[PDB]
Amino acid sequence: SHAVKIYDTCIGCTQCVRACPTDVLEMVPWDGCKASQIASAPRTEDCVGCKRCESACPTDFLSVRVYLGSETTRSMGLAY
Amino acid sequence: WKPPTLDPSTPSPIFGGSTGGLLRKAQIEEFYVITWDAKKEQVFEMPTGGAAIMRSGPNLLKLARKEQCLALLTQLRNKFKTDGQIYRVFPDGEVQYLHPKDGVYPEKVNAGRTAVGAKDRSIGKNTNPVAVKFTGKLGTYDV
Amino acid sequence: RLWCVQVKVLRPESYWFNEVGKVVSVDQSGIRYPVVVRFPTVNYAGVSTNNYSLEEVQEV
Amino acid sequence: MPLSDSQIFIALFIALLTGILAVRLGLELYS
Amino acid sequence: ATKFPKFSQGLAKDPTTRRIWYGIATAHDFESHDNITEESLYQKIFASHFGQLAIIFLWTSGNLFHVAWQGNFPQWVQDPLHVRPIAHAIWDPHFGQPAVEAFTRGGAQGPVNIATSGVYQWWYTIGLRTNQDLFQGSVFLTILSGLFLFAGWLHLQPRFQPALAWFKNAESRLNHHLSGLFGVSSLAWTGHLVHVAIPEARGQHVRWDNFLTTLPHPQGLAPFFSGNWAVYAQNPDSSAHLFGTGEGSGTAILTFLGGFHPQTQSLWLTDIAHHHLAIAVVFILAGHMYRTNFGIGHTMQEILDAHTPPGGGLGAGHKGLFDTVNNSLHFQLGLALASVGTITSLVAQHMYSLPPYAFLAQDFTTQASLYTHHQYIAGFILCGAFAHGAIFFVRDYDPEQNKGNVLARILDHKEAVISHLSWVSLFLGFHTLGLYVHNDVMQAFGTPEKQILIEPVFAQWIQAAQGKTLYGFDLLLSQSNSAAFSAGQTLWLPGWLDAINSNSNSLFLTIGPGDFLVHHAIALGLHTTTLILVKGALDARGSKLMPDKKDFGYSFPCDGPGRGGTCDISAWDAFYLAVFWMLNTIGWVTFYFHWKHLGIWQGNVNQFNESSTYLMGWLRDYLWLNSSQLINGYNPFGMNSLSVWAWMFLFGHLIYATGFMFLISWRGYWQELIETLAWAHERTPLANLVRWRDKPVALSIVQARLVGLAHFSAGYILTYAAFLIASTSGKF
Amino acid sequence: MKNFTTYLSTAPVVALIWFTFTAGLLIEINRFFPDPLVF
Amino acid sequence: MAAAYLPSVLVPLVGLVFPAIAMASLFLYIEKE
Amino acid sequence: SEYFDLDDLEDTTGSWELYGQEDEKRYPSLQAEFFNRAAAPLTRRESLLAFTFVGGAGSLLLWGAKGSKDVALPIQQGPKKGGEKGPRGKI
Amino acid sequence: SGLTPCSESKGFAKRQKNEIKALTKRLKQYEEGSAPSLALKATIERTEKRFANYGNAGLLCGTDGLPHLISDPGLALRFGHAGETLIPTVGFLYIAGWIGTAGRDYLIASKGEAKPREKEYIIDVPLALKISAQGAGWPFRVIRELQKGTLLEKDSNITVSPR
Ligand code: CLA
Ligand code: CLA
Ligand code: CLA
Ligand code: CLA
Ligand code: CLA
Ligand SMILES: CC1=C(/C=C/C(C)=C/C=C/C(C)=C/C=C/C=C(C)/C=C/C=C(C)/C=C/C2=C(C)CCCC2(C)C)C(C)(C)CCC1
Ligand code: SF4
């Protein structure tokens, strides 16, 4: 499966969670930013690796990072 | 809130069929079910291609991929203002509830969730790949 | 630190490393990256603002 | 002057021994 | 899941056909394998090196065996200018009878391939004469291969496994390799030349059964031990010597004549013996430099730590670089590939102009094939050198351990280096293409006197300084009263000046404006290939577009369509892009070599001199004109022996074109297509009785770049090899 | 007229005018002084 | 050439028999669970 | 309703036999008995691979040594025109 | 380089004669005074003038019968070939420095505007013409900037990627 690690520059904008087409990401409470929330990646077994989340992220550099890993049926996006 | 149970007596939308639906993977690996409650009978676009008619009341749709279920759910939420539930169904009969995982949509922050994958540093503070040689770790992001 | 004072970015992975931006605001609640900086140039994502820590900016 | 049949068979036999040693090295490198 | 990629559980659990492909493609990347340690990595590499050496010796044994068994080596030895050398026999059951007749050549009793590798000239020069000699050499090399395989197996056994510290003992390895592997091997080769090759060139049959009976020099070893070494240079072979016979032969064994044997048009064997003897002494001396276990010799870490300019111009200098080089196999491989590939180019440049083998210069097909072969090999090796430099920067480079030294400092001004490479590439391309296009328009409009033809006066001045008097620059070796002239006048200058002032050889060919233009094209190619490779290596760890690129490794598809889009951002992709430019550059180099030599061999130098100044001249008078015999290898009227080259010519064009499919069309089109195909098989009666084990998927993004590049390169090489060999051998 | 001259100051119009001037100058130099190879 | 029948035996062996064995065995190895 | 959790997962996942029919009586008894004893030694995967290997290799070398000569393949007749002539007086 | 002056090269003369002969062969299919006859005669006149001018410039000719240019500044100055490459080098470098200095001046002047990007695609044509005229004195100004230290931006003010 792909690894999705979150860093602490996240401003809690939730855009990566909304962008995700397979529901890998979710917002959890945090105290490190003004929005009082941070992205989390609890379901990377469903991550296809499209990097829509990284395209959505506004921080410089990225606060969500996708590291493509070992390929599975789910990560290859196969319906057969 | 508790995870809902998949009601197998739910009717399916009115559809004439297609070549884009389930394949052998549903028999031997897994498939997915999306359920939703429609306010009225109306036409929606199938994620596998073609127009279908959602029945008034509860609807059930079996799909090959989780991404297909979430694409249909995005359409239901943005075009029909309708919520839905997604399950994973295994060949042995096991049904796993998937989405929304804790009853609240993931884009809305909810108490009781715990961060996984969080790194307490900015991305430029990752170490060098030479420092993880012969350790078994996936990379500098893994440490 | 001040409002609308020029600062130099010291974050190496930032698009605006060694460049000078303008402080928009500084959060006073103890968040990790409280300094909001606006820049005259867009980065590769089209963004012109970014948040920094105190040690990541130098007043110029 | 051409080679004899025996010379060709000698070369083929020595090559077969070398190939056996090669299979041995390849299996040792594998596991 | 499966057990084929047993070194990678991540690949073994892949349920798709990608598992097989990636399992093949990652098999020799031992560092990334599961549970590998540094010591086991080095031991596996050591054994793999034994396997490669055994393969090389078996390959040489096979060439010797097939020439001995199916070739015409004694007949060629009898008439080296009028016998086509045979590589091996053809047994092809698809042959028609006209193909059987056409390929029967060289006096063979059946269809054969005519060799282009020059092994006949080499083996004849070093003293081999009969099929029995070649057979004995082949059997010896097969035994050597078996010994290497046994040693590879042996040093994998636990009590013979070398420790990791043994592999990192740099000083002892350098001492031994310089003194023994280079120096003693060169000394033993001088022994072979003096005892065997030189007497066989003088008609004396010296073999294992009589070499202890045969005197190599009439005065024995007394002049050597007494130091009266000029005895061995007295009485060289005369200018009327016939090679392989005693007629006109001398008795000298170590000379410095310079130039060429008049009959063989190759270097004197006694000069070669003296070369290898001096090389042996220099290398044995250089192998006593580094400290091992006897309290004397240099320590390389301290040498490197000492070489820092006191003015601070290089920062910390070379401090810490010993551990940087010694701990990184990729730094070592990059250095080895850069040096070996440059040496391969040097071999190509020196073997055409200073042919070392008898009757090689008259074999035009062989000379062209050898130059082209070694230059393409050199290009691939240089690409690999820079690739492993980039891999070092990603995987092995520790910035803290290299703080302030030359490596960190060149990383610290990488933008300056890359931008200046970009500037020189742009200048060369703009002006070389512009001058060519201007000349093309001048020729098209009927006014060739309006061409811009810049005389290469700098290289002509170099040729004059080395003794070529054609250009009128009177200096050094072309000035008869200069000190440089008078110093060499009794030793090597007469033969050298006879050779360099003759236009009947390849020694410092006459050059003009066409040589100017193509040399600047070569400079453009070298600088652009270097720009791509260097930018790939220096941006391998990160750039502004992807500041954390080191976290993703050497090879990865992209970083997605965000931030403007990031296709081909990895350092691997810079290698992939640079291979195209390397192939282009070696193409220009070899086109130049072949066309200039075609004019020289056909006795018409004016064709190159007049037509090479514009690109239509290259197209029409080189590619179009010389393809005529090749494409008529088979036609409606019949076929001849060039039909194999016509077929391979088209074969290479086809493979080249097929590569464009992988390079132009990208993945997601094929994945959706394969999805429809997977639907079709599951729904088709009598066919859905069978099922795949691995789920069929489209090839990956990186794999597609690789496969497209491989088809492109293979088609490139096959096409040019067919054209080169057919065009040269149909005339000569 | 201000809007029209602003359009004439857009990059491709300025490029067209400048390159027409430069190309015309080169053409007329080569018409008046045909075949210049050297200075 | 001496032993001139050998190409007519070894060419089918190296070109047909050995590749068939090799791909059959390698297929069996790389599909083994 | 096209879904059911248990005892109808085959219909839910479409695991249907479109054309296969259960049938025990197709072939005559003596014909079947003949063909089971004919193909009995090849019902082991190692024996069939050994049989096909030995037969195919023997057929291929017998073709190469003898059969290619019998059908008069051009590679077995060899040349008869004396050899192609090369340029520059080379043979 | 062993070359010969084009005015005494036999190949040069043969090329002139052959080109004139081809043009004259084309001429004898048109009436005198016709437009093709006048055009061909003008081409012939230009060809004769071109060969005379190339001979009179002291150009060296190869064995091809074609002019070859000398580009070493030493060989050009001592043997009268400075008009082939050296003087064109000075002329090109002057015009190129003019173009670059005018572009730099326009960019620097636009940097101080409220909308600096607007002047990059909507050209301030009077300002551009004024700056273009002032580019004639570029070497003096550029050398002064080099000695003063204002030509180059300092390394601490320029973005770089992480090393
Ligand atoms: C100079 C030539 C050379 C050398 C010294 C090696 C050396 C090695 N290879 Mg590499 N190989 C080569 C050429 C070479 N290979 C070529 C041309 C290819 C195709 C591109 C490969 C593809 C390859 C694969 C896919 C694997 C190796 C593996 C190995 C190791 C064990 C080899 C063995 O005999 O296992 C003997 C084992 C068996 C006979 C049963 C298992 C079958 C294995 C898994 C596949 C066959 C491997 C064999 C080398 C293929 C030969 C290719 C042929 C066209 C020349 C050893 C380090 C294996 C290793 O585990 O990685 C470190 C491994 O999986 N090789
Ligand atoms: C006047 C006295 C003098 C002079 C002229 C030198 C000169 C030199 N010394 Mg020093 N030295 C001196 C006194 C002197 N030394 C004394 C008294 C001592 C005490 C004993 C030393 C101790 C010392 C040490 C220990 C070392 C030197 C080294 C050097 C060299 C590099 C110095 C440097 O900073 O490079 C600066 C270089 C750069 C900043 C990089 C420039 C890179 C260019 C721009 C690249 C261009 C590439 C090109 C474009 C591409 C190809 C071109 C194409 C046409 C082919 C240089 C040869 C070093 C060395 O090299 O030894 C051999 C070294 O290790 N010296
Ligand atoms: C014939 C094919 C061709 C040409 C002309 C080029 C051209 C160039 N390559 Mg590209 N390359 C090619 C094939 C080619 N490449 C292929 C097949 C690949 C594999 C993908 C690459 C991969 C590649 C890489 C990876 C790099 C290059 C770079 C370069 C530049 C080299 C420096 C130079 O020569 O500047 C001179 C420029 C040229 C010769 C380009 C043509 C200039 C024209 C003729 C100017 C005049 C235009 C005309 C007046 C306009 C009329 C327009 C009309 C509509 C009015 C140049 C832009 C390098 C680079 O960018 O360095 C700066 C670089 O890093 N190439
Ligand atoms: C080195 C490899 C090699 C060799 C030695 C041959 C040899 C042959 N091929 Mg060529 N072939 C090959 C590779 C080879 N093929 C490849 C790679 C391709 C695709 C590019 C082809 C495409 C091809 C075609 C399209 C045809 C041939 C045919 C032939 C036959 C022509 C001679 C004849 O007149 O037979 C006449 C035939 C006979 C006298 C009957 C021979 C029957 C054999 C001996 C049966 C052997 C049993 C079998 C191999 C069992 C396999 C078991 C196991 C090893 C898998 C001959 C058997 C022609 C044909 O005749 O073959 C069917 C034919 O039409 N080939
Ligand atoms: C203000 C104009 C200007 C100036 C002063 C420079 C200066 C420089 N360029 Mg940059 N460049 C420019 C415009 C300019 N460039 C434009 C418009 C492009 C896009 C085509 C580039 C693309 C470019 C590349 C790809 C490279 C450079 C490089 C360089 C450097 C070496 C010189 C050179 O290679 O020239 C070559 C210049 C070109 C090939 C493009 C020039 C186009 C025209 C002639 C210039 C623009 C004129 C401008 C429109 C005038 C408007 C002024 C007016 C309104 C008053 C130097 C720093 C090289 C490098 O970095 O060296 C270290 C390098 O690799 N340039
Ligand atoms: C990236 C990288 C890398 C790589 C690199 C490379 C790949 C390079 C290449 C390089 C090269 C490839 C080089 C070459 C060079 C050469 C030279 C430098 C030479 C010199 C010469 C000379 C000096 C000579 C002289 C002479 C004589 C002796 C005689 C006479 C003549 C003359 C004068 C010429 C490495 C690994 C390191 C590391 C990491 C990074
Ligand atoms: S890569 Fe795609 S699937 Fe994975 S977390 Fe990001 S948006 Fe979701």
PDB file of all heavy atoms in Angstrom, chain B residues 19 22 24 29 123 126 128 130 133 140, chain E residues 395-396 541 548 551 679 682-683 695:
ATOM      1  N   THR B  19     -22.542  -3.550 -19.543  1.00  0.00           N
ATOM      2  CA  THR B  19     -21.328  -4.352 -19.530  1.00  0.00           C
ATOM      3  C   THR B  19     -20.302  -3.844 -18.529  1.00  0.00           C
ATOM      4  O   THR B  19     -19.254  -4.474 -18.367  1.00  0.00           O
ATOM      5  CB  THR B  19     -20.702  -4.385 -20.930  1.00  0.00           C
ATOM      6  OG1 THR B  19     -20.412  -3.046 -21.349  1.00  0.00           O
ATOM      7  CG2 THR B  19     -21.655  -5.023 -21.931  1.00  0.00           C
ATOM      8  N   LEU B  22     -20.261  -5.659 -12.295  1.00  0.00           N
ATOM      9  CA  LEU B  22     -19.405  -6.568 -11.544  1.00  0.00           C
ATOM     10  C   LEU B  22     -18.782  -7.634 -12.439  1.00  0.00           C
ATOM     11  O   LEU B  22     -19.365  -8.066 -13.435  1.00  0.00           O
ATOM     12  CB  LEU B  22     -20.196  -7.257 -10.431  1.00  0.00           C
ATOM     13  CG  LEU B  22     -20.886  -6.408  -9.366  1.00  0.00           C
ATOM     14  CD1 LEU B  22     -21.496  -7.299  -8.284  1.00  0.00           C
ATOM     15  CD2 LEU B  22     -19.919  -5.418  -8.763  1.00  0.00           C
ATOM     16  N   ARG B  24     -15.615 -11.123 -12.084  1.00  0.00           N
ATOM     17  CA  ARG B  24     -15.304 -12.266 -11.227  1.00  0.00           C
ATOM     18  C   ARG B  24     -14.717 -11.849  -9.880  1.00  0.00           C
ATOM     19  O   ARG B  24     -14.850 -12.593  -8.901  1.00  0.00           O
ATOM     20  CB  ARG B  24     -14.345 -13.211 -11.963  1.00  0.00           C
ATOM     21  CG  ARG B  24     -14.050 -14.520 -11.245  1.00  0.00           C
ATOM     22  CD  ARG B  24     -13.494 -15.583 -12.173  1.00  0.00           C
ATOM     23  NE  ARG B  24     -12.156 -15.984 -11.757  1.00  0.00           N
ATOM     24  CZ  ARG B  24     -11.904 -16.845 -10.780  1.00  0.00           C
ATOM     25  NH1 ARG B  24     -12.878 -17.452 -10.127  1.00  0.00           N
ATOM     26  NH2 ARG B  24     -10.642 -17.104 -10.453  1.00  0.00           N
ATOM     27  N   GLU B  29     -12.882 -11.996  -4.551  1.00  0.00           N
ATOM     28  CA  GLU B  29     -12.069 -11.088  -3.750  1.00  0.00           C
ATOM     29  C   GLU B  29     -12.892 -10.201  -2.823  1.00  0.00           C
ATOM     30  O   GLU B  29     -12.801 -10.358  -1.603  1.00  0.00           O
ATOM     31  CB  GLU B  29     -11.202 -10.226  -4.679  1.00  0.00           C
ATOM     32  CG  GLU B  29     -10.222  -9.316  -3.959  1.00  0.00           C
ATOM     33  CD  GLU B  29      -9.073  -8.870  -4.851  1.00  0.00           C
ATOM     34  OE1 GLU B  29      -9.240  -8.875  -6.086  1.00  0.00           O
ATOM     35  OE2 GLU B  29      -8.001  -8.522  -4.315  1.00  0.00           O
ATOM     36  N   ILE B 123       8.212  19.104   6.294  1.00  0.00           N
ATOM     37  CA  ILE B 123       8.675  18.060   5.387  1.00  0.00           C
ATOM     38  C   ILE B 123      10.161  18.184   5.056  1.00  0.00           C
ATOM     39  O   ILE B 123      10.806  17.176   4.746  1.00  0.00           O
ATOM     40  CB  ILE B 123       7.804  18.054   4.116  1.00  0.00           C
ATOM     41  CG1 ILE B 123       7.925  16.713   3.401  1.00  0.00           C
ATOM     42  CG2 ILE B 123       8.132  19.224   3.198  1.00  0.00           C
ATOM     43  CD1 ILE B 123       6.842  16.479   2.422  1.00  0.00           C
ATOM     44  N   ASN B 126      13.055  15.936   7.112  1.00  0.00           N
ATOM     45  CA  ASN B 126      13.293  14.506   6.955  1.00  0.00           C
ATOM     46  C   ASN B 126      14.788  14.240   6.797  1.00  0.00           C
ATOM     47  O   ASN B 126      15.525  15.045   6.227  1.00  0.00           O
ATOM     48  CB  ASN B 126      12.530  13.960   5.742  1.00  0.00           C
ATOM     49  CG  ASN B 126      11.045  13.763   6.013  1.00  0.00           C
ATOM     50  OD1 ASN B 126      10.578  13.922   7.138  1.00  0.00           O
ATOM     51  ND2 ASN B 126      10.297  13.413   4.977  1.00  0.00           N
ATOM     52  N   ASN B 128      18.361  11.978   5.755  1.00  0.00           N
ATOM     53  CA  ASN B 128      18.822  11.590   4.432  1.00  0.00           C
ATOM     54  C   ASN B 128      18.638  10.091   4.207  1.00  0.00           C
ATOM     55  O   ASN B 128      18.629   9.314   5.164  1.00  0.00           O
ATOM     56  CB  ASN B 128      20.288  11.969   4.256  1.00  0.00           C
ATOM     57  CG  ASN B 128      20.464  13.427   3.904  1.00  0.00           C
ATOM     58  OD1 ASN B 128      20.356  13.812   2.743  1.00  0.00           O
ATOM     59  ND2 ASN B 128      20.726  14.251   4.908  1.00  0.00           N
ATOM     60  N   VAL B 130      20.726   7.964   3.169  1.00  0.00           N
ATOM     61  CA  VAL B 130      21.878   7.201   3.643  1.00  0.00           C
ATOM     62  C   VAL B 130      21.688   6.784   5.100  1.00  0.00           C
ATOM     63  O   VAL B 130      22.164   5.722   5.513  1.00  0.00           O
ATOM     64  CB  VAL B 130      23.180   8.003   3.424  1.00  0.00           C
ATOM     65  CG1 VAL B 130      23.213   9.263   4.272  1.00  0.00           C
ATOM     66  CG2 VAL B 130      24.405   7.131   3.679  1.00  0.00           C
ATOM     67  N   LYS B 133      19.776   3.296   5.399  1.00  0.00           N
ATOM     68  CA  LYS B 133      20.295   2.124   4.706  1.00  0.00           C
ATOM     69  C   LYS B 133      20.445   0.954   5.667  1.00  0.00           C
ATOM     70  O   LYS B 133      20.938   1.116   6.787  1.00  0.00           O
ATOM     71  CB  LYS B 133      21.649   2.433   4.069  1.00  0.00           C
ATOM     72  CG  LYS B 133      21.608   3.475   2.981  1.00  0.00           C
ATOM     73  CD  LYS B 133      22.406   3.033   1.767  1.00  0.00           C
ATOM     74  CE  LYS B 133      23.896   3.129   2.012  1.00  0.00           C
ATOM     75  NZ  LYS B 133      24.662   2.416   0.962  1.00  0.00           N
ATOM     76  N   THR B 140      12.863   7.737   4.457  1.00  0.00           N
ATOM     77  CA  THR B 140      13.121   8.766   5.456  1.00  0.00           C
ATOM     78  C   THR B 140      11.830   9.263   6.092  1.00  0.00           C
ATOM     79  O   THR B 140      11.834   9.694   7.249  1.00  0.00           O
ATOM     80  CB  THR B 140      13.894   9.924   4.826  1.00  0.00           C
ATOM     81  OG1 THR B 140      13.080  10.558   3.833  1.00  0.00           O
ATOM     82  CG2 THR B 140      15.153   9.401   4.162  1.00  0.00           C
TER      83      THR B 140
ATOM     84  N   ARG E 395      21.180   8.043  -2.701  1.00  0.00           N
ATOM     85  CA  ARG E 395      21.215   6.941  -1.746  1.00  0.00           C
ATOM     86  C   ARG E 395      22.342   7.035  -0.725  1.00  0.00           C
ATOM     87  O   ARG E 395      22.160   6.628   0.423  1.00  0.00           O
ATOM     88  CB  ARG E 395      21.347   5.609  -2.488  1.00  0.00           C
ATOM     89  CG  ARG E 395      20.156   5.224  -3.337  1.00  0.00           C
ATOM     90  CD  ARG E 395      20.319   3.807  -3.873  1.00  0.00           C
ATOM     91  NE  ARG E 395      19.078   3.277  -4.418  1.00  0.00           N
ATOM     92  CZ  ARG E 395      18.923   2.044  -4.879  1.00  0.00           C
ATOM     93  NH1 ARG E 395      19.917   1.172  -4.869  1.00  0.00           N
ATOM     94  NH2 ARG E 395      17.740   1.679  -5.359  1.00  0.00           N
ATOM     95  N   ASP E 396      23.516   7.527  -1.121  1.00  0.00           N
ATOM     96  CA  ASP E 396      24.714   7.384  -0.306  1.00  0.00           C
ATOM     97  C   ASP E 396      25.267   8.692   0.239  1.00  0.00           C
ATOM     98  O   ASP E 396      26.051   8.656   1.191  1.00  0.00           O
ATOM     99  CB  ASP E 396      25.823   6.689  -1.110  1.00  0.00           C
ATOM    100  CG  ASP E 396      25.458   5.275  -1.511  1.00  0.00           C
ATOM    101  OD1 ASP E 396      24.435   4.759  -1.022  1.00  0.00           O
ATOM    102  OD2 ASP E 396      26.199   4.673  -2.314  1.00  0.00           O
ATOM    103  N   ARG E 541      18.649  15.174  -5.611  1.00  0.00           N
ATOM    104  CA  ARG E 541      18.216  15.253  -4.225  1.00  0.00           C
ATOM    105  C   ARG E 541      17.059  16.218  -4.011  1.00  0.00           C
ATOM    106  O   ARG E 541      16.415  16.154  -2.960  1.00  0.00           O
ATOM    107  CB  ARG E 541      19.394  15.651  -3.335  1.00  0.00           C
ATOM    108  CG  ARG E 541      20.519  14.642  -3.331  1.00  0.00           C
ATOM    109  CD  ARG E 541      21.729  15.161  -2.572  1.00  0.00           C
ATOM    110  NE  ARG E 541      21.382  15.609  -1.230  1.00  0.00           N
ATOM    111  CZ  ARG E 541      21.184  14.804  -0.196  1.00  0.00           C
ATOM    112  NH1 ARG E 541      21.299  13.493  -0.309  1.00  0.00           N
ATOM    113  NH2 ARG E 541      20.869  15.331   0.983  1.00  0.00           N
ATOM    114  N   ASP E 548      11.879  17.787  -1.826  1.00  0.00           N
ATOM    115  CA  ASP E 548      12.137  16.590  -1.034  1.00  0.00           C
ATOM    116  C   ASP E 548      12.326  15.366  -1.927  1.00  0.00           C
ATOM    117  O   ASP E 548      11.931  14.257  -1.570  1.00  0.00           O
ATOM    118  CB  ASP E 548      11.007  16.351  -0.036  1.00  0.00           C
ATOM    119  CG  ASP E 548       9.658  16.160  -0.713  1.00  0.00           C
ATOM    120  OD1 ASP E 548       9.499  16.581  -1.874  1.00  0.00           O
ATOM    121  OD2 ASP E 548       8.756  15.582  -0.084  1.00  0.00           O
ATOM    122  N   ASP E 551      13.711  11.890  -0.824  1.00  0.00           N
ATOM    123  CA  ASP E 551      12.837  10.985  -0.088  1.00  0.00           C
ATOM    124  C   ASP E 551      12.132   9.989  -0.999  1.00  0.00           C
ATOM    125  O   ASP E 551      11.637   8.969  -0.516  1.00  0.00           O
ATOM    126  CB  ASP E 551      11.798  11.787   0.701  1.00  0.00           C
ATOM    127  CG  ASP E 551      12.430  12.799   1.656  1.00  0.00           C
ATOM    128  OD1 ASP E 551      13.632  12.676   1.961  1.00  0.00           O
ATOM    129  OD2 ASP E 551      11.721  13.720   2.106  1.00  0.00           O
ATOM    130  N   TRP E 679     -12.767  -7.693 -19.503  1.00  0.00           N
ATOM    131  CA  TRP E 679     -14.199  -7.965 -19.588  1.00  0.00           C
ATOM    132  C   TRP E 679     -14.504  -8.999 -20.667  1.00  0.00           C
ATOM    133  O   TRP E 679     -15.313  -9.905 -20.450  1.00  0.00           O
ATOM    134  CB  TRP E 679     -14.991  -6.684 -19.863  1.00  0.00           C
ATOM    135  CG  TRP E 679     -16.452  -6.972 -20.098  1.00  0.00           C
ATOM    136  CD1 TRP E 679     -17.432  -7.047 -19.156  1.00  0.00           C
ATOM    137  CD2 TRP E 679     -17.089  -7.234 -21.358  1.00  0.00           C
ATOM    138  NE1 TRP E 679     -18.633  -7.342 -19.746  1.00  0.00           N
ATOM    139  CE2 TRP E 679     -18.449  -7.466 -21.097  1.00  0.00           C
ATOM    140  CE3 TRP E 679     -16.636  -7.300 -22.678  1.00  0.00           C
ATOM    141  CZ2 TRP E 679     -19.361  -7.756 -22.106  1.00  0.00           C
ATOM    142  CZ3 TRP E 679     -17.541  -7.596 -23.677  1.00  0.00           C
ATOM    143  CH2 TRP E 679     -18.888  -7.819 -23.386  1.00  0.00           C
ATOM    144  N   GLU E 682     -13.640 -12.780 -19.741  1.00  0.00           N
ATOM    145  CA  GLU E 682     -14.517 -13.355 -18.729  1.00  0.00           C
ATOM    146  C   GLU E 682     -15.909 -13.649 -19.272  1.00  0.00           C
ATOM    147  O   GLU E 682     -16.594 -14.524 -18.740  1.00  0.00           O
ATOM    148  CB  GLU E 682     -14.606 -12.420 -17.522  1.00  0.00           C
ATOM    149  CG  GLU E 682     -13.350 -12.397 -16.653  1.00  0.00           C
ATOM    150  CD  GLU E 682     -13.582 -11.807 -15.269  1.00  0.00           C
ATOM    151  OE1 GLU E 682     -14.741 -11.486 -14.936  1.00  0.00           O
ATOM    152  OE2 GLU E 682     -12.600 -11.664 -14.512  1.00  0.00           O
ATOM    153  N   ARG E 683     -16.333 -12.952 -20.320  1.00  0.00           N
ATOM    154  CA  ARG E 683     -17.662 -13.115 -20.889  1.00  0.00           C
ATOM    155  C   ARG E 683     -17.689 -13.986 -22.141  1.00  0.00           C
ATOM    156  O   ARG E 683     -18.765 -14.199 -22.702  1.00  0.00           O
ATOM    157  CB  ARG E 683     -18.264 -11.746 -21.210  1.00  0.00           C
ATOM    158  CG  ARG E 683     -18.413 -10.824 -20.009  1.00  0.00           C
ATOM    159  CD  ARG E 683     -19.312 -11.429 -18.951  1.00  0.00           C
ATOM    160  NE  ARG E 683     -19.582 -10.494 -17.865  1.00  0.00           N
ATOM    161  CZ  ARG E 683     -19.814 -10.854 -16.610  1.00  0.00           C
ATOM    162  NH1 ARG E 683     -19.821 -12.124 -16.247  1.00  0.00           N
ATOM    163  NH2 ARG E 683     -20.043  -9.915 -15.697  1.00  0.00           N
ATOM    164  N   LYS E 695      -3.336 -10.635 -12.640  1.00  0.00           N
ATOM    165  CA  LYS E 695      -4.276  -9.715 -13.258  1.00  0.00           C
ATOM    166  C   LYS E 695      -3.553  -8.899 -14.316  1.00  0.00           C
ATOM    167  O   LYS E 695      -2.560  -8.238 -14.000  1.00  0.00           O
ATOM    168  CB  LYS E 695      -4.887  -8.796 -12.212  1.00  0.00           C
ATOM    169  CG  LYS E 695      -5.906  -9.467 -11.314  1.00  0.00           C
ATOM    170  CD  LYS E 695      -6.289  -8.564 -10.157  1.00  0.00           C
ATOM    171  CE  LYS E 695      -7.108  -9.312  -9.124  1.00  0.00           C
ATOM    172  NZ  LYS E 695      -8.114  -8.426  -8.487  1.00  0.00           N
TER     173      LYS E 695
END
